């Protein structure tokens, strides 16, 4: 109870910033996550014995794939931490409990393939879940791990609070389906501009949390350039593996996933920043002003990809 997690000074300071990199020492990521829960939620939110056991079962159920791995889980949870800390009073005790856990669990048992590849492969998961295939699986895996003996980190919640938190976590994890992002941002855009957005309306909160989840999930584009650039390699390593698999099914993959079209990556980053990232962080800043640093950092990396195209790097 009187046991706080502390970090080294540089991590203590840098962890509060949106652009924080959790570093290459895997064995520190659990301590980093617990540190964030304790400062975001309270030392009382979770029974430390159960939290630690939940974290290590979650870690175990992430795979050794190049991008959608344990490091991504913790990076995405750190971005959510940054948002919750910079927007203290806007979120319930239950939302702070659910969203950090949601973020850690959001890509559980990811195989490094898109929903599209599961469907064209005719993977069993694509029959069980017709849309947001991987995302419903990630939630299913979260509920599985929550029901392991000793793993129920929400045991102190009432029946109805327990259901509220598993419902926050489910919508939060479904929202990481980037196909659901576009519509969700347009609705939030229209709602903000007409002045109809209302954070006491539960369906409005849901949309806002969904946008945060997109924001944290894409947060690789909000890092300092050398981090963003090096993460790009891991991202394309999955994309190109999937393209390879598409070719094995007899299907020309989209260029994004075709390793024969590496040359076009810088232009592909531009599209993604303009079509997805910038709109995402723009709308998020409108709703949550203190998240502006994510927009600024995103715009900085757009400018850096523009420099790559111009042959200046
Ligand atoms: C869009 N596009 C298109 C070409 C592209 C490249 C070469 C030739 C042609 C096109 N390259 C890109 C770049 O795509 C990304 N770049 C960076 C990141 C960061 C946030 C994680 N995510 C994505 C991305 O698409 N993330 C989506 C899809 C899977 O999970 C969610
Ligand atoms: Mg995902
Ligand atoms: Zn993700």
From Swiss-Prot:
| Effect of substituting residue 107 to N | Reduces activity 1000-fold
Tissue specificity, per the record, is: Abundant in the putamen and caudate nucleus regions of brain and testis, moderately expressed in the thyroid gland, pituitary gland, thalamus and cerebellum.
Q: Which domain of life is it from?
A: Eukaryota
Q: Which residues bind 3',5'-cyclic GMP?
A: 68, 269
Report the subcellular localization: Cytoplasm, Cytosol
- Where do the annotations place a divalent metal cation 2 binding? 107
Q: Where is the PDEase domain?
A: 1-312
Residues recorded as binding 3',5'-cyclic AMP, renumbered to this chain, are: 68, 269
Q: Name the cystine pairs.
A: none
Detail which positions bind a divalent metal cation 1: 72, 106-107, 217
Q: Which residues form the active site?
A: 68 (proton donor)
Listed under subunit, the entry gives: Homodimer.
Family membership: Belongs to the cyclic nucleotide phosphodiesterase family.
Task: Show the domain comment.
Answer: The tandem GAF domains bind cAMP, and regulate enzyme activity. The binding of cAMP stimulates enzyme activity. Composed of a C-terminal catalytic domain containing two divalent metal sites and an N-terminal regulatory domain which contains one cyclic nucleotide-binding region.
Q: What does this protein do?
A: Plays a role in signal transduction by regulating the intracellular concentration of cyclic nucleotides. Can hydrolyze both cAMP and cGMP, but has higher affinity for cAMP and is more efficient with cAMP as substrate. May play a critical role in regulating cAMP and cGMP levels in the striatum, a region of the brain that contributes to the control of movement and cognition.
- What disease association does UniProt give? Dyskinesia, limb and orofacial, infantile-onset: An autosomal recessive, early-onset hyperkinetic movement disorder characterized by axial hypotonia, dyskinesia of the limbs and trunk, orofacial dyskinesia, drooling, and dysarthria. The severity of the hyperkinesis is variable. Striatal degeneration, autosomal dominant 2: An autosomal dominant disorder characterized by striatal degeneration and dysfunction of basal ganglia, resulting in hyperkinesis.
Its recorded name reads cAMP and cAMP-inhibited cGMP 3',5'-cyclic phosphodiesterase 10A
Organism whose genome encodes this protein: Homo sapiens (Human)
């Amino acid at each position: 109870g009187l046991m706080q997690f502390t970090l080294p000074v540089r991590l203590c300071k840098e962890i509060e910033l949106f652009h924080f990199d959790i570093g290459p020492f895997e064995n520190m990521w659990p301590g980093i996550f617990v540190y964030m829960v304790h400062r975001s939620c309270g030392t009382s939110c979770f029974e430390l014995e159960k939290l630690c056991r939940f974290i290590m079962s979650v870690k175990k159920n992430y795979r050794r794939v190049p991008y959608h791995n344990w490091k991504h889980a913790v990076t995405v949870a750190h971005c959510m931490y940054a948002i919750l800390q910079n927007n203290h009073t806007l979120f319930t005790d239950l939302e702070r409990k659910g969203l950090l856990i949601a973020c850690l669990c959001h890509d559980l048992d990811h195989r490094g393939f898109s929903n599209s590849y599961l469907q064209k492969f005719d993977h069993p998961l694509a029959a069980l879940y017709s849309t947001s295939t991987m995302e419903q699986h990630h939630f299913s895996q979260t509920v599985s791990i929550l029901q392991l003996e000793g793993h129920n980190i929400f045991s102190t919640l009432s029946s109805s609070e327990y259901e509220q938190v598993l419902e926050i976590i489910r919508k939060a994890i479904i929202a990481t389906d980037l196909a659901l992002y576009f519509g969700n941002r347009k609705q939030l855009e229209e709602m903000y501009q007409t002045g109809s957005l209302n954070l006491n309306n539960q369906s409005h909160r849901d949309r806002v949390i969904g946008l945060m989840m997109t924001a944290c999930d894409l947060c690789s584009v909000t890092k300092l350039w050398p981090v963003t650039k090096l993460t790009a390699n891991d991202i394309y390593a999955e994309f190109w593996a999937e393209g390879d698999e598409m070719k094995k099914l007899g299907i020309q993959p989209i260029p994004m996933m075709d390793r024969d079209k590496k040359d076009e990556v810088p232009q592909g980053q531009l599209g993604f920043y303009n079509a997805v990232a910038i709109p995402c962080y723009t709308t998020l800043t409108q709703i949550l002003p203190p998240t502006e640093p994510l927009l600024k950092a995103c715009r900085d990396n757009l400018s850096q990809w523009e420099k790559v195209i111009r042959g200046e790097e």
